[PDB]
Amino acid sequence: GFGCPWNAYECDRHCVSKGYTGGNCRGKIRQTCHCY
């Protein structure tokens, strides 16, 4: 977890490598990451 609020490339590329569109963070509850 080295990115979310400002470092989106981290959470994004994190999933982008696996295959998913990419991991993005939102205020679903309190700034949490989620892969779509």
TrEMBL record:
Q: Does the keyword Disulfide bond apply?
A: yes
UniProt entry tagged with the keyword Repeat = no
Invertebrate defensins family profile domain spans which residues? Answer: 1-36
Keywords assigned: Antimicrobial, Defensin, Disulfide bond
Per the record, the GO terms for biological process are:
defense response
Protein origin, superkingdom: Bacteria
Disulfide bond sites: C4-C25, C11-C33, C15-C35
Q: Supply the name of the protein.
A: Arthropod defensin
Q: What is the lineage of its organism?
A: Bacteria, Bacillati, Actinomycetota, Actinomycetes, Actinomycetales
